[PDB]
Design an enzyme around this catalytic site. Structure first.
Site: not given
Ligand SMILES: *[C@@H]1O[C@H](CO)[C@@H](O[C@@H]2O[C@H](CO)[C@@H](O[C@@H]3O[C@H](CO[C@H]4O[C@H](CO)[C@@H](O)[C@H](O)[C@@H]4O)[C@@H](O)[C@H](O[C@H]4O[C@H](CO)[C@@H](O)[C@H](O)[C@@H]4O)[C@@H]3O)[C@H](O)[C@H]2NC(C)=O)[C@H](O)[C@H]1NC(C)=O
Ligand SMILES: *[C@@H]1O[C@H](CO)[C@@H](O[C@@H]2O[C@H](CO)[C@@H](O[C@@H]3O[C@H](CO)[C@@H](O)[C@H](O[C@H]4O[C@H](CO)[C@@H](O)[C@H](O)[C@@H]4O)[C@@H]3O)[C@H](O)[C@H]2NC(C)=O)[C@H](O)[C@H]1NC(C)=O
Ligand SMILES: *[C@@H]1O[C@H](CO)[C@@H](O)[C@H](O)[C@H]1NC(C)=O
Ligand SMILES: *[C@@H]1O[C@H](CO)[C@@H](O)[C@H](O)[C@H]1NC(C)=O
Ligand SMILES: [Co+2]
Ligand SMILES: [Co+2]
Lengths: 538, 538
Positions: A199, A325, A439
Site C-alpha cells: 500500500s 482492493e 487489500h
C-alpha cells in the site's frame, strides 16, 4: 569481542537475542536499533537527525515504540481490525530499526527491507503480521524493518523550513543509509538491498526508486498494491499547506497564510495525540490528510513527469494487485451501506447513489461513463453485481490501474518487470465472505504466517506461503522470481513485457498467466475519462 | 379434377409440376402463382389490387419475374456478389408466389413462408440459395415464398394517396392472405403458418408481428439478422418525402413540395430501371434510400413506441445474428480501405478515420466513446483488432443489438424466445478469410444447400445443415426447436428469458450456450451513447 549477539554499529554497540521462529528454526534478532535523534520538541515536523553515538553496550532486545497515530476502534476488538493497530506503546520517539538474521549467520546475504504501509496515517514495523522470523529462517535472508513518522507528525507541509514536508520519507531514507553502513556486520550485503512494501509502504518504495537522495541506497524493489501515481499517494503543495492550516485551526492554533511561523510553533506545543486526532475533516474515500508532497529535496517533480521522462532507477520490479482492493476502504467509508455483516448486497438505486459519493469530483457525464463501465450488463440490477461494482471502481482507480501504469513504464524503459494478481482467500478470513481477497491479504503469506501452526492455516496454504515466500526471496537475490531448475511446485512467472503485459495469478490451484490485469478498465480511467472530462468541462 | 398437380385457387385453376430436390427426394412445385394485379402504369407506387379471376387452367410451372432492381456489378462475376443478383427477367409484373409441397403430399403440415431480404432495394424469391425443394423434402413442410416490390417502385413515399408508401409491405400482406385462403388446397395447415426472413426480410417478418393488418394472418415467426428497431429499417415521413423529391429531381422531373401530384405523375411515366438506378446518392453505410415508413394503415406508430407499449403478437420467436455482420456492408461502402483480397488489415490511424466515416452523424465526444468501446485494450494498435473492430461497431449498431432488443421485449412480454449466434464458415466460402461468418451466411444452411450432391460441402456441413433445418422446421411445427425425445446429436436450445438472455451457438463442434450475445456493446449503443449525445449536445 567474540560474542556474536553483540554488534558494533557506526554509532555504538548493540546486543541482540536468539529467538525461535514459529517454524521451530532459530534466528538472531536485534529490535529497536536507534537510527536517529528522537524528533521531539523543536525537531517535530522537521527532517530526522542522525543518532548521537552512545557509550557502553545497548540492549536491542525489545520491540520499539510505534509512532503517534490514530487507533481503529470502529469495529472494536475485531481481529481483522486490531491486527493493524499498534502493538507497542505510542511515542514521538519511534525512529528505530529491526534486524533479523538466520542461524547459522550467513557470510554475506541479500537483505529484504520492509517499509510498512498505513495510508501514511498509521502503521508500525512491530505488527505481528510482519514477522521476520519466518521469512528469514525459511529463505535464508536478512530481514529488516524500519519505523517512520506517520500522519501530520511525519507529513505536515507548510513550505517553511519549519515544516518542509516528507519528514517520514526522510526517516525512511536515513534508515536506508543506516543499512548500507551497518548491515554487513549482521551478515548483510549493502549492494543487494531489496525494498518491499504494501500500500503506502509500496508507494514509499516507489518514491525511493524515483528519489535522488535514495537512488544508490538499495538494489531492487517489490511493490505490493502500491504506486506513486495513485490519487492518494501525493498531494499538491497548495492543498498540503491548507490541510496544515485546517489542522492548526481545528486544534486551536493560529491559522494565517501570512505568518506561518506562529502556526508551527503553536503546533509544536500541542499534544501529539491531540494533533493526529484532528486531521480528519471532510475527505472522500481513499484520500488521506497528510501524505508525501513534491518538496524539492526528496522529490523535485511529480511522479507523473518522472515516469513520463523515464527519470527513475534502472532495476528489476516485482509488483501486483489483489482482486478486491476497493472493499476495505468502502467498508470504513460509506458505512451504512456495506455493513460488517454476512450477505451484504446493493440495490441498483443504492449503487447509483454510491458512484456519486465515491467520485465526488466528476461532472455527471463522467458519472454516467462510470455507471456504464462498472455495471454488469448480463444482469444490470443484480444486487451482488452492483456491490462488486463498487469494489472494482474504487479498487481500479485507486490501486490496480496505478500499479499497472508504473509496471508498464518500467518495462518500456527496458527493465524486467514481474506482475502478479493475488486471488487467494484464507479459510480463516475473519471478514464477511463477500469481501473476497481484500487489500493487504497477501501480507500474511509473504511473511510466512501460515507456517505458524498455532494459527490453523491449511496444509495447502502452508505450501502456498512457502511458494510466494520463495518467489519474493529469490527475486531479491537473483532479480527473477523463477527458480534456476524450473520446478513443478514453482510454475513459471513470465516477465511483464511492454507489449505482452503478462501477469502470473497467485492462487492455490493455478499457474494461470493473463494479460493485465484489468486492461480495459485501466484504459477507462487513464485514457477515456480524462478526455471526456476535458470535453464536457463546459 | 383427379390430377393432384391441378389445384383450384379462389381466382382460378393452376397446374404444377413434380421435380426432384438435388438430394433426389421428389416434390410437387407451383411456380409463379399470381396473387395480385400487375402494378403497372397507373398502379405504380400504389398498393396491390387482388388477382383478377382467370378462365381455364394456368401452368404455374415457370419461375416468376424478379421485380425491377439494380444489379451488383461492383465485383463483376464474383460468385459472392452474383448469388444475390436476380436470376429471372426483370419486370414490374413480378407479384407472384411459389408453393413447394413434399411427396407423399401431407395432410395439413406446417407452412414455412419465406420473405427475402435485400435492404428493401433488391432481392427475389427465385434465387438458387432460396431453393425450397431441399427444405420441403427433408423436413416434410410446405415451403412458400413470395415476391414483393422493392426500391422506390415498392416504397416511394410523398404523403399523397398516389404515393402512400409501404407498397412492398402491402404486397407481402396480400400474399399472406392468399396463403391463408389457399394453402390447405396444397396440403398445408393455415393455422400453422410460420413467417421466416433474413435481413430486410426479417425486418418485414417483424413488421407483420407488429402490423394491425397482418396480425391474424400467421402463427409464428423466425427472424434472421433483422428487427424493426434497426436504424435502417424506416424513415421519417418527413425524410421519405425528401428522398422521393430528390429522386424526382435526379430522374429529371418536377421536385416541388407545393404539388407532389405533378411529380408522382412523371415518375409513373419514367422507365423503371431508370428509377432504381438513380435512388443512390448521399447515403452513409447501412442506410437505404427507400424503406418502410409509418403510414397509419400498415403501421400507425413507430416500432419503438409499438415495442415500448407491448402491442405485438403473443407468439414464439426464433431469432439471431451472425458473428461478423458488419463486414459485408463495409466491403461495399468504404471500398478503398478493406479491399476484396486476402489478409487485409487496418492501421490504428485508418481505424480512427473509419469510425468518423461509419458514424457521420455523431458529435465527436461520441466518437471518443466509440473508439474506446471498440478497441482491443490488450493490444490497441493491432491491425487485426482494428479491422475486426470495424466489423463489430457496424454489426452491433445496425444488426446484432437490434435483434437483441426485439427478442428481449418479446421475452419480457412473456413469450418463448429462442436466440442463436451463427458461427460457421463454409469450407468453400468465396470471400477472403478475414471476413469470417458474414451477413446471410446462414441462408445456405437453413435452405439445405449442403445436401446438394453437385456442390462441394463437407459431410459435417451436411449434418449441420440438417440440424439447423430441423431446429427451424419443428419450431414452425411445435413452437420449440428442441426434439421431443431430447437427443444428443441435436443439443438443447435453452429459451431466451428476459432475465437469463441465453443464446445457442450454432456451429460445427459446439453445443455452447452463452448470454446475449454481446450485451455490453449493445448497452453501449442502446443505453450509454444516446444519453452521452444528449449531454454533449447544445
Ligand atoms: C400447359 O398449357 C398447355 C397450353 O398452354 C397445355 O396444353 C397442351 O398442349 C399440347 C399441344 O397443344 C397437347 O399435346 C397434344 O395436342 C395436340 C393438338 O393438336 C395440335 O398440335 C399438334 C402439334 O403440336 C398436332 O397434332 C396438330 O398440328 C395440331 O395443331 C394433339 O396432337 C394431341 O392429341 C392427340 O391425342 C391422341 C393420343 O391420345 C393422338 O393419337 C392424336 O394425334 C391426337 O391429336 C395432344 O393432346 C397437350 O396434350 C396439352 N396438354 C394436355 C394436358 O392436354 C398443357 O396441358 C399444359 N402443360 C402440361 C404439361 O400439361
Ligand atoms: C542489558 O541491560 C542490563 C541492565 O541494564 C544488564 O544486565 C546485566 O547482565 C549481567 C550479565 O548477563 C547480569 O549479571 C548478573 O550479576 C548479578 C550481580 O549482582 C548476579 O547476581 C547475577 O547472577 C544471578 O543469576 C541467576 C539469574 O537467573 C539467579 O540465580 C540469581 O539472580 C543470580 O544472582 C548475574 O550474574 C546482570 O543482571 C546485569 N548487570 C549489570 C551490572 O548491568 C546488561 O547490560 C544487559 N544484559 C544483557 C544480557 O543483555
Ligand atoms: C484444481 O485443483 C483441484 C484440487 O483441489 C483438482 O481438482 C485439480 O488439480 C484442479 N482442477 C482440475 C484440473 O480439474
Ligand atoms: C471438438 O473440439 C474439441 C476441442 O476441445 C475436441 O475434442 C475435438 O477437436 C472436437 N471433438 C470431436 C467430437 O471431434
Ligand atoms: Co479563524
Ligand atoms: Co430545382
Amino acid at each position: 569481542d567474540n560474542d556474536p549477539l553483540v554488534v558494533n554499529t557506526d554509532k555504538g554497540r548493540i546486543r541482540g537475542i536468539t529467538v525461535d521462529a514459529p517454524s521451530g528454526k532459530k534466528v538472531d534478532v536485534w529490535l529497536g536499533i536507534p537510527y536517529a535523534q528522537p524528533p521531539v520538541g523543536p525537531l517535530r515536523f522537521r527532517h530526522p537527525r542522525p543518532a548521537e553515538k552512545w557509550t557502553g553496550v545497548l540492549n536491542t532486545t525489545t520491540p520499539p515504540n510505534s509512532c503517534v497515530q490514530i487507533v481503529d476502534t470502529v469495529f472494536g476488538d475485531f481481529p481483522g481490525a486490531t491486527m493493524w493497530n499498534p502493538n507497542t506503546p505510542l511515542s514521538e520517539d519511534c525512529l528505530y530499526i529491526n534486524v533479523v538474521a538466520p542461524r547459522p549467520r550467513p557470510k554475506n546475504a541479500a537483505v529484504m527491507l520492509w517499509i510498512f504501509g498505513g495510508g501514511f496515517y498509521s502503521g508500525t514495523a512491530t505488527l505481528d503480521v510482519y514477522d521476520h522470523r519466518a521469512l528469514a529462517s525459511e529463505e535464508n535472508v536478512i530481514v529488516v524493518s524500519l519505523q517512520y513518522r506517520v500522519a501530520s507528525l511525519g507529513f505536515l507541509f507548510l513550505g517553511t523550513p519549519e515544516a518542509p514536508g516528507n519528514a517520514g520519507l526522510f526517516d525512511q531514507n536515513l534508515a536506508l543509509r543506516w543499512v548500507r553502513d551497518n548491515i554487513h556486520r549482521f551478515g548483510g550485503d549493502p549492494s543487494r538491498v531489496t525494498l518491499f512494501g504494501e500500500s503506502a509502504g509500496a508507494v514509499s518504495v516507489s518514491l525511493h526508486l524515483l528519489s535522488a537522495l535514495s537512488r544508490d541506497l538499495f538494489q531492487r524493489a517489490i511493490l505490493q498494491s502500491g504506486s506513486p501515481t495513485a490519487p492518494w499517494a501525493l498531494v499538491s503543495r497548495e492543498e498540503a499547506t491548507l490541510r496544515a492550516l485546517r489542522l492548526a485551526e481545528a486544534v486551536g492554533c493560529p491559522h494565517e497564510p501570512s505568518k506561518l511561523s506562529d502556526a508551527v510553533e503553536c503546533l509544536r506545543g500541542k499534544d501529539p495525540h491531540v494533533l493526529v486526532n484532528n486531521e480528519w475533516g471532510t475527505l472522500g474515500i481513499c484520500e488521506f490528510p497528510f501524505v508525501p508532497v513534491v518538496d524539492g529535496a526528496f522529490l523535485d517533480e511529480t511522479p507523473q513527469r518522472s515516469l513520463a521522462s523515464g527519470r527513475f532507477k534502472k532495476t528489476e520490479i516485482l509488483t501486483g494487485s489483489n482482486t478486491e482492493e476497493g472493499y476495505y476502504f468502502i467498508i470504513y467509508y460509506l458505512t451504512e451501506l456495506l455493513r460488517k455483516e454476512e450477505g451484504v448486497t446493493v440495490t441498483r438505486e443504492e449503487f447509483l447513489q454510491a458512484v456519486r459519493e465515491l467520485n465526488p469530483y466528476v461532472n455527471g457525464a463522467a458519472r454516467q461513463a462510470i455507471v456504464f463501465e462498472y455495471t454488469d450488463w448480463t444482469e444490470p440490477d443484480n444486487p451482488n453485481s452492483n456491490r462488486d461494482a463498487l469494489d472494482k471502481m474504487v479498487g481500479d482507480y485507486h490501486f490496480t490501474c496505478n500499479v499497472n501504469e508504473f509496471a508498464q513504464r518500467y518495462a518500456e524503459e527496458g527493465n524486467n518487470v514481474y506482475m502478479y494478481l493475488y486471488t487467494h482467500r484464507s479459510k480463516g478470513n475473519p471478514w464477511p465472505r463477500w469481501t473476497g481477497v481484500m487489500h493487504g491479504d497477501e501480507i500474511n503469506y509473504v511473511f510466512g504466517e501460515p507456517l505458524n501452526p498455532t494459527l490453523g492455516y491449511t496444509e495447502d496454504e502452508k505450501d502456498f506461503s512457502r511458494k510466494i515466500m520463495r518467489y519474493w526471496s529469490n527475486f531479491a537475490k537473483t532479480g527473477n522470481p523463477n527458480p534456476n531448475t524450473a520446478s513443478s511446485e514453482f510454475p513459471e512467472w513470465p516477465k511483464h513485457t511492454a507489449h505482452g503485459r503478462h501477469y502470473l495469478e497467485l492462487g492455490l490451484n493455478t499457474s494461470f498467466v493473463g494479460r493485465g490485469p484489468r486492461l480495459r478498465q485501466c484504459a477507462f480511467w487513464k485514457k477515456y475519462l480524462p478526455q471526456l472530462v476535458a470535453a464536457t468541462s463546459n
